[PDB]
């Protein structure tokens, strides 16, 4: 939520993208297509799995304790045993509630972060050869086939190659 | 009168999550803490003219 | 000619200082107190059933000190013992007084 | 603080904006004016009300417990009751201290975030028709009356309408 | 990590920068040089010292408690004393682990944040006179001596002085 991409300037997600968490949809003179971006996707997963690594399968061994159920009324000593237990249960129950709320806020936010970073990296790569349409898409002001499109995705796009062409188109009258 | 939370000092409203009135309580009560005040921001940082 | 467009946010003349993770005193636009720090000085009789012990301890009402005869067979959610309470019957003790008092209270 | 808008590139807040938390001040050929932005303001308020919902009116019922004041010295059993109580109180006192500091950092930061988003959304809307002066304000390189200004605020500004006009002004010699 | 500057578009840190945490490296017709930025460095330091202030030298006094070691087997009363202590120990131990993980996450991110802000501030100052090469560096499209570079760092750079020059260079064919 906090970076404002996911559920923000990105209107919604793409249900037809089943091979990654983040990616690219393009349109050009040969048609329109889609490809997942591996690095951003993996980055998000690694952080979530890190949370999982701290939380899953990490239980503490406890052995002989105090009794916690009682068949006879006894008073003072029984009051104390039960209260200790009730007190313990409430604090652990508290930590867990807080933990989940906190982990969940940070997870929506970290995923929002990864989408935005991918946007920014892409934004920067195109230099003066593209403009931000405001909804996560870029208008590319030059002919850009799949190989061209592939180069952006592959991080090998050479902005200098297209610049004259792109500039003429942007700044036409 | 009508109040969910009773302490030896008297009944207290139970809207707040915490209280420093008395460690002794009965009913739907805020949890006792040592602080006399804990202020939760309900607005952005203030940067006056 | 043209135009200028500025983005901004509000502020107030009477901000309140709160503590955060990185600074113990930062001014914000508004805040709320999370610690109840006062009582009205009385125990409300609703919605819980209050029983005022007056001159009688729980144990004395139990045993049946004559001045506690009014307490016979009554129920309570919260029994309130007054510091002014006193026994006025045959002098007694209760081994583990606190437990008996407790089990009856509960 | 963490996004760097509020108490950052936004030099300060506007005390005269009392009908919203975020908004626009403009200057043009017909004058200068101010209007709150409802959507960003509501976004900030909603998250803060969400925190309050977890915190306000949510107390736990407790009934018979242990005694916590004592008129006679007793030793072993009384030390434990007192120790149990002090321990509980200290832990609850910790969570509360930790809760508020954490909530407050997150609240300042999320509000900073919403201001920046509004800046970002607005920045994107204007395309090549405006430049960022660096202090949260944009210089718009064309005549832009109230209807024009209203359109930016209203999210209906058509960058294409003014582009020729704006570009000539930006890239003059 | 979350803003994507540190360990992100900034390929790495500079070990040779020993007089600040953030700063500038430049190259021009008179050479290439380095200067720390004092304000951003201090901003980061100030936030970290604040955490330390909450944590360092702030211990709680405790006096007479319960016994915690025992030379004889006693059963019920002894089980409870031990259980009370173990329970206490486990909860304090939890808060600390969580505290450090949380504090550490926020510190890397806040430091990432400060780096990004300095970049963003710098980006705005240069207006249309520079382009983002995508790795935290700007290509400046005009002659820029030490005095020129110094002016950017010092926040007194006048984009109007160089704008005509820069535009001719940027928008060449
Ligand atoms: C600064 O912020 C506080 C808190 O956001 C504002 O306090 C608001 O005051 C009203 C009236 O007391 C509260 O209404 C009450 O709500 C509780 C539970 O929600 C309900 O049980 C009561 O019957 C009553 O209606 C309200 O909760 C509270 N705002 C919120 C959202 O918590 C205060 O107005 C602000 N101060 C200024 C000057 O802006
Ligand atoms: C609620 O009652 C308690 C108990 O009477 C009050 O605690 C006393 O506070 C005074 C003032 O500092 C101390 O001198 C006494 O030692 C305390 N008494 C005991 C037995 O702890 C407390 O002040 C009351 N709370 C409020 C908010 O009125
Ligand atoms: C509880 O017992 C006390 C003590 O005996 C009573 O206090 C007396 O009240 C009467 C009537 O006002 C006075 O005339 C006496 O001076 C009081 N005696 C003492 C020793 O103080 C009190 O009435 C009883 N309380 C209740 C509610 O039954
Ligand atoms: C990236 O582009 C290069 C240049 O064509 C190509 O050879 C290579 O297959 C691409 N790399 C990946 C991993 O897609
Ligand atoms: C947005 O545009 C519509 C269509 O002209 C207009 O009726 C409405 O008043 C505008 N909204 C605001 C609040 O300016
Ligand atoms: C910033 O530039 C101004 C104008 O020359 C000068 O007065 C000041 O000394 C400079 N600041 C630093 C620290 O270089």
mmCIF file of N, CA and C in Angstrom, chain D residues 46-164:
data_model
loop_
_atom_site.group_PDB
_atom_site.id
_atom_site.type_symbol
_atom_site.label_atom_id
_atom_site.label_comp_id
_atom_site.label_asym_id
_atom_site.label_seq_id
_atom_site.Cartn_x
_atom_site.Cartn_y
_atom_site.Cartn_z
ATOM 1 N N UNK D 46 -8.339 6.687 6.927
ATOM 2 C CA UNK D 46 -8.798 5.304 6.992
ATOM 3 C C UNK D 46 -7.788 4.384 7.661
ATOM 4 N N UNK D 47 -6.506 4.592 7.388
ATOM 5 C CA UNK D 47 -5.486 3.743 7.983
ATOM 6 C C UNK D 47 -5.377 4.029 9.476
ATOM 7 N N UNK D 48 -5.435 5.307 9.846
ATOM 8 C CA UNK D 48 -5.393 5.682 11.257
ATOM 9 C C UNK D 48 -6.626 5.208 12.032
ATOM 10 N N UNK D 49 -7.806 5.297 11.422
ATOM 11 C CA UNK D 49 -9.017 4.780 12.061
ATOM 12 C C UNK D 49 -8.957 3.257 12.236
ATOM 13 N N UNK D 50 -8.265 2.592 11.314
ATOM 14 C CA UNK D 50 -7.998 1.164 11.393
ATOM 15 C C UNK D 50 -7.185 0.742 12.603
ATOM 16 N N UNK D 51 -6.157 1.531 12.906
ATOM 17 C CA UNK D 51 -5.355 1.353 14.114
ATOM 18 C C UNK D 51 -6.204 1.532 15.366
ATOM 19 N N UNK D 52 -7.022 2.579 15.373
ATOM 20 C CA UNK D 52 -7.901 2.877 16.498
ATOM 21 C C UNK D 52 -8.886 1.742 16.732
ATOM 22 N N UNK D 53 -9.412 1.186 15.644
ATOM 23 C CA UNK D 53 -10.342 0.069 15.742
ATOM 24 C C UNK D 53 -9.752 -1.142 16.463
ATOM 25 N N UNK D 54 -8.445 -1.353 16.334
ATOM 26 C CA UNK D 54 -7.806 -2.453 17.049
ATOM 27 C C UNK D 54 -7.620 -2.112 18.516
ATOM 28 N N UNK D 55 -7.537 -0.814 18.797
ATOM 29 C CA UNK D 55 -7.120 -0.323 20.106
ATOM 30 C C UNK D 55 -8.237 0.237 20.989
ATOM 31 N N UNK D 56 -9.275 0.816 20.394
ATOM 32 C CA UNK D 56 -10.275 1.514 21.194
ATOM 33 C C UNK D 56 -11.490 0.626 21.434
ATOM 34 N N UNK D 57 -11.890 0.499 22.699
ATOM 35 C CA UNK D 57 -13.084 -0.253 23.038
ATOM 36 C C UNK D 57 -12.906 -1.759 22.938
ATOM 37 N N UNK D 58 -11.697 -2.253 23.196
ATOM 38 C CA UNK D 58 -11.395 -3.669 22.969
ATOM 39 C C UNK D 58 -10.824 -4.406 24.173
ATOM 40 N N UNK D 59 -11.178 -3.945 25.364
ATOM 41 C CA UNK D 59 -10.583 -4.455 26.591
ATOM 42 C C UNK D 59 -11.031 -5.890 26.895
ATOM 43 N N UNK D 60 -10.248 -6.587 27.710
ATOM 44 C CA UNK D 60 -10.504 -7.978 28.073
ATOM 45 C C UNK D 60 -11.151 -8.058 29.460
ATOM 46 N N UNK D 61 -12.170 -8.909 29.597
ATOM 47 C CA UNK D 61 -12.830 -9.127 30.887
ATOM 48 C C UNK D 61 -12.026 -10.078 31.747
ATOM 49 N N UNK D 62 -11.763 -9.654 32.978
ATOM 50 C CA UNK D 62 -11.162 -10.537 33.958
ATOM 51 C C UNK D 62 -11.983 -10.486 35.225
ATOM 52 N N UNK D 63 -12.008 -11.587 35.958
ATOM 53 C CA UNK D 63 -12.884 -11.639 37.109
ATOM 54 C C UNK D 63 -12.113 -11.910 38.389
ATOM 55 N N UNK D 64 -12.325 -13.077 38.986
ATOM 56 C CA UNK D 64 -11.562 -13.439 40.171
ATOM 57 C C UNK D 64 -10.120 -13.759 39.800
ATOM 58 N N UNK D 65 -9.189 -13.180 40.546
ATOM 59 C CA UNK D 65 -7.771 -13.305 40.250
ATOM 60 C C UNK D 65 -7.036 -13.697 41.527
ATOM 61 N N UNK D 66 -5.897 -13.061 41.774
ATOM 62 C CA UNK D 66 -5.196 -13.243 43.035
ATOM 63 C C UNK D 66 -5.237 -11.915 43.782
ATOM 64 N N UNK D 67 -5.012 -11.948 45.090
ATOM 65 C CA UNK D 67 -4.880 -10.715 45.860
ATOM 66 C C UNK D 67 -3.572 -10.018 45.525
ATOM 67 N N UNK D 68 -3.565 -8.703 45.693
ATOM 68 C CA UNK D 68 -2.471 -7.878 45.205
ATOM 69 C C UNK D 68 -2.023 -6.846 46.241
ATOM 70 N N UNK D 69 -2.689 -6.842 47.391
ATOM 71 C CA UNK D 69 -2.280 -6.020 48.524
ATOM 72 C C UNK D 69 -2.366 -6.881 49.743
ATOM 73 N N UNK D 70 -1.481 -6.618 50.690
ATOM 74 C CA UNK D 70 -1.343 -7.541 51.784
ATOM 75 C C UNK D 70 -1.087 -6.761 53.067
ATOM 76 N N UNK D 71 -1.782 -7.130 54.140
ATOM 77 C CA UNK D 71 -1.676 -6.400 55.402
ATOM 78 C C UNK D 71 -0.681 -7.016 56.397
ATOM 79 N N UNK D 72 -0.274 -8.254 56.138
ATOM 80 C CA UNK D 72 0.675 -8.950 57.000
ATOM 81 C C UNK D 72 1.853 -9.513 56.220
ATOM 82 N N UNK D 73 3.008 -9.566 56.868
ATOM 83 C CA UNK D 73 4.176 -10.226 56.304
ATOM 84 C C UNK D 73 3.957 -11.743 56.347
ATOM 85 N N UNK D 74 4.202 -12.431 55.232
ATOM 86 C CA UNK D 74 3.952 -13.875 55.166
ATOM 87 C C UNK D 74 5.089 -14.685 54.553
ATOM 88 N N UNK D 75 5.968 -14.040 53.797
ATOM 89 C CA UNK D 75 7.068 -14.769 53.192
ATOM 90 C C UNK D 75 6.763 -15.413 51.852
ATOM 91 N N UNK D 76 7.136 -16.689 51.732
ATOM 92 C CA UNK D 76 7.273 -17.394 50.454
ATOM 93 C C UNK D 76 6.098 -17.253 49.505
ATOM 94 N N UNK D 77 4.897 -17.466 50.018
ATOM 95 C CA UNK D 77 3.729 -17.453 49.165
ATOM 96 C C UNK D 77 3.427 -16.029 48.685
ATOM 97 N N UNK D 78 3.533 -15.050 49.579
ATOM 98 C CA UNK D 78 3.310 -13.652 49.200
ATOM 99 C C UNK D 78 4.320 -13.046 48.211
ATOM 100 N N UNK D 79 5.592 -13.422 48.337
ATOM 101 C CA UNK D 79 6.629 -13.000 47.392
ATOM 102 C C UNK D 79 6.279 -13.421 45.980
ATOM 103 N N UNK D 80 5.784 -14.644 45.836
ATOM 104 C CA UNK D 80 5.470 -15.174 44.520
ATOM 105 C C UNK D 80 4.273 -14.469 43.896
ATOM 106 N N UNK D 81 3.220 -14.251 44.678
ATOM 107 C CA UNK D 81 2.069 -13.491 44.196
ATOM 108 C C UNK D 81 2.452 -12.088 43.730
ATOM 109 N N UNK D 82 3.268 -11.411 44.531
ATOM 110 C CA UNK D 82 3.750 -10.079 44.185
ATOM 111 C C UNK D 82 4.640 -10.120 42.948
ATOM 112 N N UNK D 83 5.515 -11.122 42.888
ATOM 113 C CA UNK D 83 6.453 -11.257 41.779
ATOM 114 C C UNK D 83 5.706 -11.553 40.493
ATOM 115 N N UNK D 84 4.680 -12.388 40.596
ATOM 116 C CA UNK D 84 3.834 -12.707 39.457
ATOM 117 C C UNK D 84 3.217 -11.417 38.945
ATOM 118 N N UNK D 85 2.698 -10.609 39.865
ATOM 119 C CA UNK D 85 2.044 -9.364 39.483
ATOM 120 C C UNK D 85 2.990 -8.327 38.898
ATOM 121 N N UNK D 86 4.148 -8.141 39.514
ATOM 122 C CA UNK D 86 5.114 -7.195 38.973
ATOM 123 C C UNK D 86 5.584 -7.576 37.575
ATOM 124 N N UNK D 87 5.825 -8.870 37.387
ATOM 125 C CA UNK D 87 6.259 -9.413 36.107
ATOM 126 C C UNK D 87 5.239 -9.155 35.003
ATOM 127 N N UNK D 88 3.968 -9.424 35.297
ATOM 128 C CA UNK D 88 2.877 -9.216 34.346
ATOM 129 C C UNK D 88 2.823 -7.741 33.979
ATOM 130 N N UNK D 89 2.865 -6.889 34.996
ATOM 131 C CA UNK D 89 2.729 -5.456 34.798
ATOM 132 C C UNK D 89 3.870 -4.917 33.940
ATOM 133 N N UNK D 90 5.089 -5.394 34.180
ATOM 134 C CA UNK D 90 6.238 -4.947 33.392
ATOM 135 C C UNK D 90 6.152 -5.328 31.913
ATOM 136 N N UNK D 91 5.656 -6.532 31.643
ATOM 137 C CA UNK D 91 5.501 -7.025 30.274
ATOM 138 C C UNK D 91 4.416 -6.308 29.492
ATOM 139 N N UNK D 92 3.312 -6.033 30.177
ATOM 140 C CA UNK D 92 2.227 -5.262 29.595
ATOM 141 C C UNK D 92 2.696 -3.841 29.353
ATOM 142 N N UNK D 93 3.474 -3.329 30.300
ATOM 143 C CA UNK D 93 4.039 -1.997 30.185
ATOM 144 C C UNK D 93 4.988 -1.927 28.990
ATOM 145 N N UNK D 94 5.769 -2.982 28.769
ATOM 146 C CA UNK D 94 6.600 -3.044 27.567
ATOM 147 C C UNK D 94 5.901 -3.028 26.226
ATOM 148 N N UNK D 95 4.899 -3.877 26.088
ATOM 149 C CA UNK D 95 4.169 -3.974 24.844
ATOM 150 C C UNK D 95 3.562 -2.609 24.520
ATOM 151 N N UNK D 96 3.014 -1.937 25.532
ATOM 152 C CA UNK D 96 2.352 -0.650 25.331
ATOM 153 C C UNK D 96 3.355 0.398 24.861
ATOM 154 N N UNK D 97 4.530 0.417 25.485
ATOM 155 C CA UNK D 97 5.579 1.365 25.118
ATOM 156 C C UNK D 97 6.003 1.067 23.704
ATOM 157 N N UNK D 98 6.219 -0.213 23.435
ATOM 158 C CA UNK D 98 6.644 -0.633 22.117
ATOM 159 C C UNK D 98 5.544 -0.351 21.093
ATOM 160 N N UNK D 99 4.290 -0.618 21.458
ATOM 161 C CA UNK D 99 3.177 -0.446 20.525
ATOM 162 C C UNK D 99 3.053 0.985 20.015
ATOM 163 N N UNK D 100 3.064 1.937 20.943
ATOM 164 C CA UNK D 100 2.879 3.349 20.607
ATOM 165 C C UNK D 100 4.010 3.978 19.778
ATOM 166 N N UNK D 101 5.253 3.660 20.135
ATOM 167 C CA UNK D 101 6.428 4.120 19.393
ATOM 168 C C UNK D 101 6.392 3.611 17.960
ATOM 169 N N UNK D 102 6.054 2.332 17.827
ATOM 170 C CA UNK D 102 5.951 1.676 16.530
ATOM 171 C C UNK D 102 4.787 2.243 15.715
ATOM 172 N N UNK D 103 3.619 2.365 16.345
ATOM 173 C CA UNK D 103 2.437 2.895 15.667
ATOM 174 C C UNK D 103 2.691 4.305 15.191
ATOM 175 N N UNK D 104 3.359 5.081 16.035
ATOM 176 C CA UNK D 104 3.612 6.474 15.723
ATOM 177 C C UNK D 104 4.601 6.644 14.551
ATOM 178 N N UNK D 105 5.672 5.844 14.515
ATOM 179 C CA UNK D 105 6.610 5.887 13.386
ATOM 180 C C UNK D 105 5.889 5.561 12.101
ATOM 181 N N UNK D 106 5.046 4.539 12.176
ATOM 182 C CA UNK D 106 4.327 4.052 11.018
ATOM 183 C C UNK D 106 3.280 5.083 10.582
ATOM 184 N N UNK D 107 2.639 5.740 11.551
ATOM 185 C CA UNK D 107 1.647 6.776 11.249
ATOM 186 C C UNK D 107 2.233 8.033 10.567
ATOM 187 N N UNK D 108 3.375 8.519 11.059
ATOM 188 C CA UNK D 108 4.087 9.636 10.424
ATOM 189 C C UNK D 108 4.537 9.271 9.026
ATOM 190 N N UNK D 109 5.041 8.049 8.900
ATOM 191 C CA UNK D 109 5.531 7.541 7.629
ATOM 192 C C UNK D 109 4.430 7.282 6.592
ATOM 193 N N UNK D 110 3.280 6.775 7.034
ATOM 194 C CA UNK D 110 2.202 6.461 6.099
ATOM 195 C C UNK D 110 1.558 7.742 5.579
ATOM 196 N N UNK D 111 1.519 8.760 6.432
ATOM 197 C CA UNK D 111 0.966 10.056 6.055
ATOM 198 C C UNK D 111 1.902 10.787 5.094
ATOM 199 N N UNK D 112 3.202 10.629 5.335
ATOM 200 C CA UNK D 112 4.249 11.117 4.442
ATOM 201 C C UNK D 112 4.070 10.430 3.097
ATOM 202 N N UNK D 113 3.834 9.122 3.151
ATOM 203 C CA UNK D 113 3.588 8.321 1.961
ATOM 204 C C UNK D 113 2.428 8.847 1.108
ATOM 205 N N UNK D 114 1.296 9.153 1.736
ATOM 206 C CA UNK D 114 0.121 9.617 0.991
ATOM 207 C C UNK D 114 0.335 10.958 0.298
ATOM 208 N N UNK D 115 1.067 11.847 0.959
ATOM 209 C CA UNK D 115 1.415 13.129 0.369
ATOM 210 C C UNK D 115 2.239 12.899 -0.899
ATOM 211 N N UNK D 116 3.235 12.023 -0.793
ATOM 212 C CA UNK D 116 4.138 11.718 -1.901
ATOM 213 C C UNK D 116 3.378 11.103 -3.077
ATOM 214 N N UNK D 117 2.443 10.202 -2.775
ATOM 215 C CA UNK D 117 1.625 9.551 -3.800
ATOM 216 C C UNK D 117 0.839 10.585 -4.586
ATOM 217 N N UNK D 118 0.299 11.565 -3.868
ATOM 218 C CA UNK D 118 -0.513 12.602 -4.482
ATOM 219 C C UNK D 118 0.392 13.439 -5.357
ATOM 220 N N UNK D 119 1.591 13.705 -4.851
ATOM 221 C CA UNK D 119 2.609 14.387 -5.631
ATOM 222 C C UNK D 119 2.908 13.561 -6.877
ATOM 223 N N UNK D 120 3.181 12.272 -6.675
ATOM 224 C CA UNK D 120 3.486 11.386 -7.792
ATOM 225 C C UNK D 120 2.374 11.244 -8.815
ATOM 226 N N UNK D 121 1.142 11.076 -8.344
ATOM 227 C CA UNK D 121 0.012 10.963 -9.256
ATOM 228 C C UNK D 121 -0.099 12.243 -10.091
ATOM 229 N N UNK D 122 -0.009 13.389 -9.413
ATOM 230 C CA UNK D 122 -0.092 14.707 -10.051
ATOM 231 C C UNK D 122 1.054 14.902 -11.037
ATOM 232 N N UNK D 123 2.263 14.540 -10.615
ATOM 233 C CA UNK D 123 3.445 14.662 -11.460
ATOM 234 C C UNK D 123 3.244 13.924 -12.771
ATOM 235 N N UNK D 124 2.753 12.698 -12.657
ATOM 236 C CA UNK D 124 2.510 11.836 -13.804
ATOM 237 C C UNK D 124 1.424 12.407 -14.728
ATOM 238 N N UNK D 125 0.384 12.995 -14.141
ATOM 239 C CA UNK D 125 -0.731 13.559 -14.904
ATOM 240 C C UNK D 125 -0.313 14.639 -15.908
ATOM 241 N N UNK D 126 0.615 15.489 -15.478
ATOM 242 C CA UNK D 126 1.095 16.655 -16.231
ATOM 243 C C UNK D 126 2.084 16.332 -17.350
ATOM 244 N N UNK D 127 2.612 15.110 -17.329
ATOM 245 C CA UNK D 127 3.499 14.600 -18.375
ATOM 246 C C UNK D 127 4.667 15.556 -18.595
ATOM 247 N N UNK D 128 4.804 16.020 -19.823
ATOM 248 C CA UNK D 128 5.889 16.911 -20.183
ATOM 249 C C UNK D 128 5.401 18.359 -20.131
ATOM 250 N N UNK D 129 4.243 18.597 -19.513
ATOM 251 C CA UNK D 129 3.616 19.919 -19.560
ATOM 252 C C UNK D 129 3.971 20.769 -18.340
ATOM 253 N N UNK D 130 4.727 20.195 -17.409
ATOM 254 C CA UNK D 130 5.066 20.898 -16.179
ATOM 255 C C UNK D 130 6.454 20.441 -15.741
ATOM 256 N N UNK D 131 7.129 21.250 -14.930
ATOM 257 C CA UNK D 131 8.390 20.823 -14.334
ATOM 258 C C UNK D 131 8.388 20.918 -12.811
ATOM 259 N N UNK D 132 9.078 19.985 -12.163
ATOM 260 C CA UNK D 132 9.158 19.946 -10.707
ATOM 261 C C UNK D 132 10.175 20.992 -10.229
ATOM 262 N N UNK D 133 9.721 21.982 -9.468
ATOM 263 C CA UNK D 133 10.599 23.047 -8.980
ATOM 264 C C UNK D 133 11.376 22.596 -7.733
ATOM 265 N N UNK D 134 11.108 21.377 -7.265
ATOM 266 C CA UNK D 134 11.847 20.799 -6.150
ATOM 267 C C UNK D 134 11.329 20.977 -4.725
ATOM 268 N N UNK D 135 10.254 21.740 -4.531
ATOM 269 C CA UNK D 135 9.753 22.010 -3.179
ATOM 270 C C UNK D 135 8.275 21.611 -3.081
ATOM 271 N N UNK D 136 7.887 20.636 -3.903
ATOM 272 C CA UNK D 136 6.512 20.176 -4.023
ATOM 273 C C UNK D 136 5.590 20.935 -4.957
ATOM 274 N N UNK D 137 6.100 21.997 -5.563
ATOM 275 C CA UNK D 137 5.312 22.793 -6.492
ATOM 276 C C UNK D 137 5.741 22.496 -7.945
ATOM 277 N N UNK D 138 4.800 22.575 -8.885
ATOM 278 C CA UNK D 138 5.110 22.483 -10.316
ATOM 279 C C UNK D 138 4.910 23.788 -11.076
ATOM 280 N N UNK D 139 5.895 24.139 -11.900
ATOM 281 C CA UNK D 139 5.709 25.199 -12.880
ATOM 282 C C UNK D 139 5.087 24.623 -14.142
ATOM 283 N N UNK D 140 3.894 25.114 -14.453
ATOM 284 C CA UNK D 140 3.142 24.699 -15.625
ATOM 285 C C UNK D 140 3.409 25.706 -16.734
ATOM 286 N N UNK D 141 3.933 25.222 -17.857
ATOM 287 C CA UNK D 141 4.450 26.089 -18.915
ATOM 288 C C UNK D 141 3.391 26.473 -19.941
ATOM 289 N N UNK D 142 2.173 26.690 -19.454
ATOM 290 C CA UNK D 142 1.083 27.162 -20.293
ATOM 291 C C UNK D 142 0.045 27.897 -19.451
ATOM 292 N N UNK D 143 -0.775 28.710 -20.112
ATOM 293 C CA UNK D 143 -1.868 29.388 -19.437
ATOM 294 C C UNK D 143 -2.787 28.332 -18.880
ATOM 295 N N UNK D 144 -3.115 28.440 -17.605
ATOM 296 C CA UNK D 144 -3.916 27.401 -16.994
ATOM 297 C C UNK D 144 -4.918 27.992 -16.014
ATOM 298 N N UNK D 145 -6.099 28.354 -16.512
ATOM 299 C CA UNK D 145 -7.107 28.984 -15.664
ATOM 300 C C UNK D 145 -7.722 27.994 -14.666
ATOM 301 N N UNK D 146 -8.735 28.434 -13.925
ATOM 302 C CA UNK D 146 -9.333 27.606 -12.876
ATOM 303 C C UNK D 146 -9.910 26.304 -13.416
ATOM 304 N N UNK D 147 -10.533 26.364 -14.591
ATOM 305 C CA UNK D 147 -11.088 25.160 -15.193
ATOM 306 C C UNK D 147 -9.944 24.201 -15.497
ATOM 307 N N UNK D 148 -8.835 24.750 -15.982
ATOM 308 C CA UNK D 148 -7.645 23.953 -16.247
ATOM 309 C C UNK D 148 -7.131 23.351 -14.942
ATOM 310 N N UNK D 149 -6.969 24.213 -13.937
ATOM 311 C CA UNK D 149 -6.516 23.807 -12.608
ATOM 312 C C UNK D 149 -7.453 22.786 -11.983
ATOM 313 N N UNK D 150 -8.749 23.047 -12.112
ATOM 314 C CA UNK D 150 -9.767 22.156 -11.597
ATOM 315 C C UNK D 150 -9.657 20.777 -12.207
ATOM 316 N N UNK D 151 -9.350 20.735 -13.500
ATOM 317 C CA UNK D 151 -9.160 19.480 -14.223
ATOM 318 C C UNK D 151 -8.002 18.614 -13.722
ATOM 319 N N UNK D 152 -6.910 19.242 -13.295
ATOM 320 C CA UNK D 152 -5.782 18.498 -12.733
ATOM 321 C C UNK D 152 -6.230 17.857 -11.436
ATOM 322 N N UNK D 153 -6.856 18.680 -10.611
ATOM 323 C CA UNK D 153 -7.378 18.263 -9.329
ATOM 324 C C UNK D 153 -8.425 17.174 -9.497
ATOM 325 N N UNK D 154 -9.192 17.300 -10.576
ATOM 326 C CA UNK D 154 -10.331 16.436 -10.854
ATOM 327 C C UNK D 154 -9.891 15.187 -11.628
ATOM 328 N N UNK D 155 -8.604 15.120 -11.935
ATOM 329 C CA UNK D 155 -8.054 13.979 -12.642
ATOM 330 C C UNK D 155 -8.548 13.862 -14.070
ATOM 331 N N UNK D 156 -8.979 14.972 -14.660
ATOM 332 C CA UNK D 156 -9.458 14.942 -16.038
ATOM 333 C C UNK D 156 -8.634 15.784 -17.014
ATOM 334 N N UNK D 157 -7.501 16.307 -16.552
ATOM 335 C CA UNK D 157 -6.617 17.112 -17.389
ATOM 336 C C UNK D 157 -6.135 16.269 -18.570
ATOM 337 N N UNK D 158 -6.264 16.820 -19.773
ATOM 338 C CA UNK D 158 -5.826 16.155 -20.996
ATOM 339 C C UNK D 158 -4.515 16.777 -21.448
ATOM 340 N N UNK D 159 -3.409 16.094 -21.173
ATOM 341 C CA UNK D 159 -2.080 16.635 -21.433
ATOM 342 C C UNK D 159 -1.896 16.960 -22.905
ATOM 343 N N UNK D 160 -2.587 16.200 -23.748
ATOM 344 C CA UNK D 160 -2.462 16.356 -25.183
ATOM 345 C C UNK D 160 -2.935 17.735 -25.663
ATOM 346 N N UNK D 161 -3.899 18.317 -24.954
ATOM 347 C CA UNK D 161 -4.470 19.614 -25.327
ATOM 348 C C UNK D 161 -3.473 20.774 -25.271
ATOM 349 N N UNK D 162 -2.572 20.695 -24.299
ATOM 350 C CA UNK D 162 -1.670 21.794 -23.993
ATOM 351 C C UNK D 162 -0.228 21.522 -24.403
ATOM 352 N N UNK D 163 0.031 20.318 -24.903
ATOM 353 C CA UNK D 163 1.398 19.841 -25.070
ATOM 354 C C UNK D 163 2.238 20.689 -25.998
ATOM 355 N N UNK D 164 1.673 21.028 -27.152
ATOM 356 C CA UNK D 164 2.365 21.861 -28.119
ATOM 357 C C UNK D 164 2.720 23.182 -27.451
#
